């Protein structure tokens, strides 16, 4: 409808697949050549099913800060025979908070959905179904089961993935550049 939906809208329809594993149909967000990102809790393992074809799981790792405290944010590289549009300069390099932001998700649940959650803040530590977990944005939309995984956007920033919520409030997981040097 405007231009933030129109940059959520250019992530989802290239740089995201729908993942499937024993723990549900997610929103996969496509980083670069074929490494993605998909919450934790997802239990990602050795194989995964992405847009309903069986593909071997080549790494996974599942984030943790430098205190050895959860980010809820697993890394996978796919064996799939095709790469990823490079998105790293739509990474913010920095922990922040953010105007005017919006949650995009695509399943077979959720097809081409899009979300105007307004204001992000830096939540920072949350405690995540038990799990002590840093790195959290906080948005004040009464997000559902369906949405973990999807893509929270700003204009021109890529800048969290869907991780739970309250039935208030809405939380992501930041992405940061630096997770996807090379
Ligand atoms: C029911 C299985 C379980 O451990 N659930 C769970 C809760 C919180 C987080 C952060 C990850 C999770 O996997």
Same mark, same amino acid.
Request: proline share 4%; with cysteine; hydrophobic share 40%.
């Given at each position: !409808?405007?231009? #933030? +939906?129109?940059?959520?809208?250019?992530?989802?329809? $290239?740089? *995201?697949?729908?993942?499937?594993? %024993?723990?549900?149909?997610? *929103? !996969?967000?496509?980083?670069?050549?074929?490494?993605?990102?998909?919450? @934790?809790?997802?239990?990602?393992? %050795?194989?995964?099913?992405?847009?309903?074809? &069986?593909?071997?799981?080549?790494?996974?790792?599942?984030?943790?800060?430098?205190?050895? *405290?959860?980010?809820?944010?697993?890394?996978? $590289?796919?064996?799939?025979?095709? $790469?990823?549009?490079?998105?790293?300069?739509?990474?913010?390099?920095? &922990?922040?908070?953010?105007?005017?932001?919006?949650?995009?998700?695509? @399943?077979? $649940? +959720?097809?081409?959905?899009?979300?105007?959650?307004?204001?992000?803040?830096?939540?920072?530590?949350?405690?995540?179904?038990? @799990?002590?977990?840093?790195?959290?944005?906080?948005?004040?939309?009464? /997000?559902? =089961?369906?949405?973990?995984? #999807?893509?929270?956007?700003?204009?021109?920033?890529?800048? #969290?993935?869907?991780?739970?919520?309250?039935?208030?409030?809405? +939380? =992501?997981?930041?992405?940061?550049?630096?997770?996807? /040097?090379?």
């Amino acid at each position: !409808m405007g231009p #933030g +939906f129109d940059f959520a809208q250019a992530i989802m329809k $290239k740089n *995201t697949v729908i993942a499937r594993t %024993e723990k549900g149909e997610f *929103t !996969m967000l496509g980083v670069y050549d074929r490494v993605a990102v998909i919450p @934790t809790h997802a239990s990602v393992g %050795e194989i995964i099913y992405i847009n309903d074809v &069986e593909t071997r799981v080549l790494d996974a790792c599942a984030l943790r800060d430098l205190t050895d *405290t959860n980010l809820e944010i697993t890394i996978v $590289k796919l064996d799939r025979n095709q $790469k990823f549009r490079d998105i790293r300069h739509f990474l913010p390099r920095c &922990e922040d908070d953010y105007n005017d932001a919006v949650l995009s998700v695509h @399943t077979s $649940k +959720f097809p081409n959905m899009y979300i105007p959650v307004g204001q992000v803040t830096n939540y920072g530590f949350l405690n995540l179904g038990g @799990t002590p977990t840093h790195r959290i944005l906080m948005y004040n939309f009464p /997000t559902r =089961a369906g949405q973990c995984g #999807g893509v929270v956007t700003t204009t021109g920033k890529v800048i #969290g993935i869907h991780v739970g919520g309250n039935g208030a409030q809405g +939380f =992501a997981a930041m992405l940061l550049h630096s997770y996807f /040097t090379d």
